[PDB]
Structure formats: C-alpha cells, structure tokens
Design a protein around this nucleic acid. Structure first.
Lengths: 262, 124, 185
RNA sequence: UGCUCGGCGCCGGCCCGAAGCGUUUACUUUGAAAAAA
RNA sequence: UGGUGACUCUAGAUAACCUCGGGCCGAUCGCACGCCCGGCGGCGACGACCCAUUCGAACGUCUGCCCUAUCAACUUUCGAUGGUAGUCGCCGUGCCUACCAUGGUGACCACGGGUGACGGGGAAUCAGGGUUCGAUUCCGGAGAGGGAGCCUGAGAAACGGCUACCACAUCCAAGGAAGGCAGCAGGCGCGCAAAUUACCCACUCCCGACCCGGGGAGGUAGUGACGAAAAAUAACAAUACAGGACUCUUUCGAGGCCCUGUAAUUGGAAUGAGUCCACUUUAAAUCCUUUAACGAGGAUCCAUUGGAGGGCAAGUCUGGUGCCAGCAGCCGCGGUAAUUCCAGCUCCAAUAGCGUAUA
RNA sequence: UACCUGGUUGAUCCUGCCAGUAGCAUAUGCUUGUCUCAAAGAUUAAGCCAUGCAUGUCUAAGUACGCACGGCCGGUACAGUGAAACUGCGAAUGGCUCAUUAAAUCAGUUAUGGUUCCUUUGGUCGCUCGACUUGGAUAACUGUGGUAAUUCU
C-alpha cells in the first residue's frame, strides 16, 4: 500500500470481538487509542451486542454522542473508541457501571459493579522515564504519563490511580506470592498466584503461576497483570473466578443445571 | 380469538422507549395486519396508538405462531427524534423526495461542470 | 468481497461397481420394504453410517483413559441414545460397529407413522406425511425423511387443520356437496 | 555434581533457599508464542 | 539521578553556536452569565515545538521454493570482495566516490535457460505412504499501454495528478485543443468458453467542518440445469384371476378371514403446481410463509437420457437392406438364418436428470 | 468399503501395455414441475474502447454587506435560514487483474541499543530577565471581452 489502512473485514477481526459472519462484509475498525488493535474492545460492538441497547450503526451514534457515555471519567463522542482492558464505563442515566475484565475464556464479559468502587482503575507500568530536568515519569499500559511517582515503583509493578484526579493512591510490588491474572496469549483470564520467575538475558522471560486448585501453568512476562496482594484481591471477581474448568466438568454442571432448571 | 403474548421485556431510559418481541397466536387464520396488533398493544400497555412501532413480522411453517419485534415510545417527539425515516414514512409522519439517484448524479455533474453563481442556474 | 457462505458438502456417495446382482437385490429390497423414493437416500444413509463408523474407528484407535476419548465417546453415545436407535443397556463404545442400515431407517418419520397404526400402508403413510396432515408436538411436518427422537415418539398425531384429526372438510367433499344440491335442486 | 550470600527450625555453630560456575550435538517428553474462515 | 544482559543510554556541569529559504514561547472562535471594589471568574472549540503511546511503514537475522548439464566453472576495477575516510539518505551498509590486496561462490548443483510460475492460508482424491491444482472473495506483493522524471502532502515515483517518447487514437475554419474501463454496466476483437447500458444508501462500514451530506465500497432484484440440500408425477375397495399360509378329500374340491400380486368396470378420501383477493417482507416491491374464492380419473396437470453378444443390469422377439448402409471406448458384428445395422413390442440402469470430448 | 474385468495362443502359465470402472471441473448435446442456497470474460488478447456513473464535505463553536428568503422599536455593527467563494481536512482508503518476478515474493521466528510516523490518548504549553488588537493583497460580487471547442481565461 501507499499509506495506512482504514478498513477491516469481518473475518479478519479478532475472535474475542466474536461477532458474526454473514450479516456484513466490513467490520468496525477502532480509532487510534491507548490500547493495541488486537485486544481492544470498541464501544459500538459492546453497546449493540453485549447490552443490545441499539440495533443499527446510527443508533449507536444516537446513543453515544449526546454525552451519555463516560469512559474512565471523561466523556467520549466516538463510536469506534477502543475501550481496552481495565476500563470503567459509566451510564449516568440508567444508573450502573461496568468494568472491562477478561472472562475465564478468551473474551470480555459484562461485570456489574457498585458505583463507589468505580472510582479507581488499576494500571500496569511499562517503563520508567526521566524528564528534561530530573523529572521522574511513570508510563503505564494505557499511555497515561504520570509525573512525580514514588521511587519504589519498578519496571513491572502495578499502581492504583484515582480517576477524577489522575494521581497515585496505592501500588503492589511484583514478587513471589501475589494474585496475578494473565492478559494476552493462548492462556487468558486465569487467576493464580506467582510462584517463581526466571531471567533470560536477551530473551523473553517466563514465569510460573499456580492456580488456586493447583493447576500450575506458565506464560510470558509481558502477559502478566498482578491485581492483588497475597491472595486477597482488590477488584471484584467475575463469575467462575478465572478457574479454567476442563470441558468435562462444565459439561457436567451444564447437565446439572439442566435438571435443576426443570 | 387472537391473543398477544410477549417476552424479552426490557426498558431503557437511554433511548426513552421500551422494546420487546411479540408472539402472535392466530390458529386457522391469515397473518394479522400491523394496525390491529398496534391497537391491541395500545390497549395492553395503556398508551395512545401513535408511538408504537412494529416491524419484521415473519410466519412459521403451519401458521399457528408468528413472531415479530416491536417497541413502545414515551411521547411523539421522541418518536420523531430518534427513529428511521422509512418507518415514520410508513406511519405517514414523514415524506421523502421523489428523485432518483441518476438525475441527481447528472445534476451534480452539471454543477461540477460550471463555476460561479451559475451552478444554481444550470441546476434548474 | 460479498457476505456469502460457500459452505456445502455432498450427502450421498456413488458406489464403485455400477452393475452387480446382489447389491441391487438388497438395495431394491430396502427401497421396496421401507417405501423409499430412489437410491439416493439409501446411499446417504450408508454415508452417514460410514461417517459414524469412521469416527468410531478413529476413537478406538486412541488409547484408553484419554480425556478426549471419554469426551466424544460420551457425546457420541449420548447422541445415539437420544436418537433412540441404540438401546439404553448397550452403553459401550465398541457397540457402534454392530448396527446396520435398517436400524437407522427404523427411526424414519414415515415408518414411525406406519407403525403407529394411524396409516394403512407405507406408501399411504408417505403420501399422508407429504400432504401436511401430521404434526410433531404442535408443528406440522410435510417431509418423510425426518429423524424422530426418542422423546418425541409419544407426541405424533394428526394436524388440527387436517380433516382427519377434526376440522373443515376437504375440497372434494364440499365440491361433492355442491354437486349434490346442484343435482337435487 | 560440588564451591560467596542468609531461612521453616535451635543456642561463633547443623540443615534448607543461592549472586555466580557446574564439558558438546542429534534423538525423545513437557510448556510458551503460534491471524480468521 | 534511573534502567537494561549489555550504550558513545537518560539525566547533570562547563564553553560557545543557533541558519533572515528563519524551531517554540496563542494578535483565534462560541454558551451560560456573575462576585468583590476598572481589575477578577466556569464550561468548551481550534492551533502548537516537544516526548511516550496507537495504526503502521521501512531496511535486517535463521529456516523453507518447479524443471533442466544438448547449462561446469562464474563475477571483477563500466565494482564483484573486504579495509580507511567521506557524499547522499530518516538511520546501518560499495548505495555511491578517492586509495589499497585480489578477492567471493561452486559437484552439498553456483552461474545460464525455461516455466501453460504471483506466494501463502487452502481444494480434489485418499487404508497407510502419497499425486495434482491454487487467477479467484482472507493476508502480503506488483501494475494501471510500456519505459523515464516530478509537484503537493506526514504518508505517492500516484496515473478517476502532472510532464516528455513511441504505438494507438478524438475534434477542427488546419493555426491548434483533448486521451487512457487489468472500476460499475455495456460494445468490438478473441475463442469451445463466461450475465442487467436496473433500484437504494435501509442494513455493514468508510470520508468530511460532521446526528443531518456522499459512497457502482456494498445491499436488493433479474439473467443462471457451474455446483450443493430438501422434494410432486398418487393412495385407498368389491369384483374381472394365479397361488402360497392351518385342517381334509390316495389325487381334482372346500373354509381362504391377514390374503399377495396385475388390467382403461364403478363412486370417494384427497391435496399440490398455475390462475389469483388479502396479509406479510422490503428504501419500495418481488422471493418464502399464512389465508379467502378457483383448481385432477386415461387425475393429457402425459419424465426423459443412454443401452439390451462379453466387460456389463437387461429378448437366440418381429419386419427391412443383405461385407452395402452402418454399429463398435476394446474384442469384434455386417456374405440374402444379423442374440450387435435400420424401425415397432417387451425388459434393465439412474432419475429431474442423463450421455460425449478434454485436464 | 485396503476391490478388479476383457483382449496376443490350436489350448496353458507369465512380463507388459491397451480398453472398461468411480470422483473431480470446463465446454457442449438432449430434457425439465416446487423450493433453499450459489459460481459466473481466468485460461486464447495485461487487446481496443463509444457512452452514463464511480469522492466529496458544516456544527451551539474559521470567514455572511449575494435583499436568495426573512423577524423590529432598526439606530451601541451583526435576529435568523442561507446559494456562491476563500480556508483546513480526505482524495496514498476502497475496487479490478496476475503481465513481470525462482531465495525474488511469501510463511514461521527474531531486531531497530541502526530511523520515521497524519490522527487519537496522557504530560508539557508565567520554567527564558530583555497591545483594550498591527499591515496590505486576493476571492465571491459588479462591469468590460477574444477563441471552433474545454472544469480555458
């Protein structure tokens, strides 16, 4: 090509968007934002599929542009705004809030949260930067540059920031024995405790995470998002608690729900 | 004889309307018109039969059960505000221009041909 | 770049030998005894049995106590029980290789209506299915190649719009009545 | 397979965990990353 | 100060520079309107040198490509090999300059040639192992007659941008102007071979100053036996008649109620194609479904396509020409008795499908 | 379904090929009632094209002295709707085709610590020690013309 692309086909969409096949030829390409294109969830798919508040493309605009949707506190007027991992969606008129978290399978899920908990968003630091006059900068995963952080914040930690002030409140160090959850890769949405971490010079580092049921696994270091201290979490967990049931036992509880429903 | 039962009822204040799917049971009869089920749903929900919009009514094999999608608004101004133009034209509340795409395209090319104030003169 | 599907597969299969005595003998015997139209549906029943046999051979190739083997072993056995062709007491994986074409053809809608005793002959049953007279749990079916499940076996009856099950008399009955009062008056 | 740091326990000391080293290939087994249809 | 496995990293200090074709340090525009005693105030919109982030692009590392020896040596100061210093480039490097030694690859197939070669995700066939194809909806690459050059813009060697050549080619008062359907329809050529000069932005997205405008991107309809799935052409009795099933008359005969099957006697149980009102779908209709009134007895509301010596299902039937006409994928049939030719009767094969030629 | 059959001889056993058998996708021939899907100028000519269409764009927030309409008490300019034109944006996306190309393209894995990046998001934007608003040009418009024609001037 001679420049950047602007169109996206339906089958070229990522599977966690998880939309259909025969109902259209083009797909909603998200606008430029903080998250990458592969794992972000734009607002139009979420509104017209997960909540079914609208039906058509223009009805999503007639929902959105009238200052009714608040993403991370501020109001967004773009239908293709990429709302990625660990973001809060505010519905001021109806009166509930949502937090975008990964389900036990490889897709996003709706999560009803109480409003007073919806005042802080967890961010993972990517790198540490020093400004032009000895000014420490704190670059997070959502490209939110925070000036003057704590000196104890290292490269792979996490912070808890306040939405309406944009300032640091609490943080969790990355070490052995913390509640972590995996973002990205084939393994996705599992809840476990970190047990060990090796170091590879010049290569990708790999950690080993143990599930609460003892089903240990291993993912890369860049797919690591620690959310809790020890085993006490800070955010509200979704249904299933990220436990990754192998197919026989959720088949069994599906049959069990089949006779329990009647 | 003809009864109306509905399901998937949900109310959103973000669109100032309430929407639901409608199941119609008319055994041994032709499929019902939209006006009769509109006034029946008006009698059901105690609303004037002018903000109720129904569309997409299909018929199963045998004709015992027919399904469709409807919605109830709150006032006439909200129904005039956020609705497709073709359904308001079906209710007679909106008229669209009776010009084809073709003559519009040679009209646009004819104003593209000339420059100045004469664009409105050549457009006839 | 259109929004199409292009997904289709063949259902029947053509045999290798075109002309042979015995194969034609039991194929014609099955067609005559089960009231079938032509050889395409018995070839497609053979192809479905071949698919199930190939799946069973592939599953028995895999070793014991593998979770995939137990998973679609239970899935295949549950599906074959839910069809109703397999007996409940034969709950084993290697019993899939021991049934034939007429077991699958026994669960056809045509022969189920014929065994229910509300039809005279098998061809009369096929005509009566074809001509919109029998509902399957308040849903009319006009096609004979319908696999009746075990749960839906006890809910086969005449349609309420049919004159046999109680309704308006047919077109030739009212025409006969019109001819009767035409000739009488 | 062993040789400078501090952990589960006891009164300068026994064990456990090690910064760092712990001779080469193919082979086999387990994990990650591996577009959708 | 801080970090990487590692900087000539980031940050810090000192001395200067800082391009008139010039880096920033707001001479911009709306809404609601106020407090204190002319200043002081909220919510926005636009623009801006910088960093990080996002869509990317770009040059690189390792591994993997069809055939051919009637292609065994190839490339070199008209740079092929490396070193030093430079120009240009957004950086890295013979990318290119000035100087140095002759280097580098090859029988583990270089170099040369052909390809009816865009590559891959894939498709057909298939016990296992394999063979063939992939123009074709997804991803990437290349081009808009073929070369060459360029402006603008962040991003183009752009062609629904420009400039010059040749080929082709439009108009003309002859001095001069205007061209690129390997886009959507359509025409000619070509060939065995491939569709409407239709409707709509309503659904899915895209672009703009942006609910509001536009889009042959797309969606809808028609043509469509490429191909795939379901599925009509009939069912039900008494008698025109042959026998088996349980018991006898040595043997013919009988009860024969389930009978079983075939021929244009009789009246019914019927529903479907089509003709059509309506309803529904839809931007508006058409298609499907529902539903009135019509609509079948030889239910003319008529099912063809190839064969009947062997392979290979299926007549030593009838009539005609009689090594002629012809049939036959292969054996072989035809000579005035043809189980094969040419026509009627019967029969078998698959069935809305069947036969032939090519890869 | 891990499958064979006829043919060299006076008769037999073999190597071997020929011909039958099934699928696949191209053309063609005969034939044809319902309905759901659906390919479709690629093989020869990346040959030539007449026509019509395929890229345009305004909010409460860049310029409004076109009476083109239009509100009043006109008097501290501009009520408002507004064609046209200046300005910024996109036109480098999408769509068609396979001619060239054989370690070229492409696939998996890696690096930019050897560079750039429209736009979105976050920060920076009294960090420098020395006017209560400046200047002249062009549109649109009016008027004057030549050409055989042009999105010419």
């Amino acid at each position: 090509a001679r420049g950047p692309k602007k169109h996206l086909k339906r089958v070229a969409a990522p599977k966690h968007w998880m939309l259909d096949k025969l109902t259209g030829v083009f797909a909603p390409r998200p606008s430029t934002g903080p998250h990458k294109l592969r794992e972000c969830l734009p607002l139009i798919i979420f509104l017209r599929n997960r909540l079914k508040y609208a039906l058509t493309g223009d009805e999503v605009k007639k929902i959105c542009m009238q200052r009714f949707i608040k993403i991370d506190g501020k109001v967004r007027t773009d239908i293709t705004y990429p709302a990625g991992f660990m973001d809060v969606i505010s519905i001021d008129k109806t009166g509930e809030n949502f937090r975008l978290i990964y389900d036990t399978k490889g897709r996003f899920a709706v999560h009803r949260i109480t409003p007073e908990e919806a005042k802080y968003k967890l961010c993972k630091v990517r790198k540490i930067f020093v400004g032009t006059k000895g000014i420490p900068h704190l670059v997070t995963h959502d490209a939110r540059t925070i000036r003057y952080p704590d000196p104890l914040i290292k490269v792979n930690d996490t912070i808890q920031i306040d939405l309406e002030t944009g300032k640091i409140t609490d943080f969790i160090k990355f070490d052995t024995g913390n509640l972590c959850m995996v973002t990205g890769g084939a393994n996705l949405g599992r809840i476990g405790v970190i047990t060990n971490r090796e170091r590879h010079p010049g290569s990708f580092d790999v950690v080993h995470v143990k599930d609460a049921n003892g089903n240990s696994f291993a993912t890369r270091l860049s797919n690591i998002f620690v959310i809790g201290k020890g085993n006490k979490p800070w955010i509200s967990l979704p249904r299933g608690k990220g436990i990754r049931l192998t197919i026989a036992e959720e088949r069994d509880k599906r049959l069990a729900a089949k006779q329990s429903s009647g | 004889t003809v009864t109306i039962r509905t399901r998937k009822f949900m109310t959103n204040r973000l669109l100032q309307r309430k929407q639901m799917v409608i199941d119609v049971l008319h055994p041994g009869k032709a499929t019902v018109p939209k006006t009769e089920i509109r006034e029946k749903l008006a009698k059901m929900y105690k609303t004037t039969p002018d903000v109720i919009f129904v569309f997409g009514f299909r018929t199963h094999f045998g004709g015992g059960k027919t399904t469709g999608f409807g919605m109830i608004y709150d006032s006439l101004d909200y129904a005039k505000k956020n609705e497709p133009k073709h359904r308001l034209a079906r209710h007679g509340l909106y008229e669209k221009k009776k010009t084809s795409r073709k003559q519009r395209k040679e009209r646009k090319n004819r104003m593209k041909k000339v420059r100045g104030t004469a664009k409105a003169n050549v457009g006839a | 770049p259109v929004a199409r599907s292009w997904v289709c597969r063949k259902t029947y299969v053509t045999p290798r030998r075109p002309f042979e005595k015995s194969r034609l003998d039991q194929e014609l015997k099955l067609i005559g005894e089960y009231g079938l139209r032509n050889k395409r549906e018995v070839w497609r029943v053979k192809f479905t049995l071949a698919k199930i046999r190939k799946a069973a051979r592939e599953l028995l190739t895999l070793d014991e106590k593998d979770p995939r083997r137990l998973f679609e072993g239970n899935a295949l056995l549950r599906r074959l029980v839910r069809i109703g062709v397999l007996d409940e007491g034969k709950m084993k994986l290697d019993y899939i290789l021991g049934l034939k074409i007429e077991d699958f053809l026994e669960r056809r809608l045509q022969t189920q209506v014929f065994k229910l005793g509300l039809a005279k002959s098998i061809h009369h049953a096929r005509v009566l299915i074809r001509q919109r007279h029998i509902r399957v749990r308040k849903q009319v079916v006009n096609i004979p190649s319908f696999i009746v499940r075990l749960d839906s076996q006890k809910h086969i009856d005449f349609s309420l719009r049919s004159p046999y099950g109680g309704g308006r008399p047919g077109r030739v009955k009212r025409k006969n009545a019109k001819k009767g009062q035409g000739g009488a008056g």
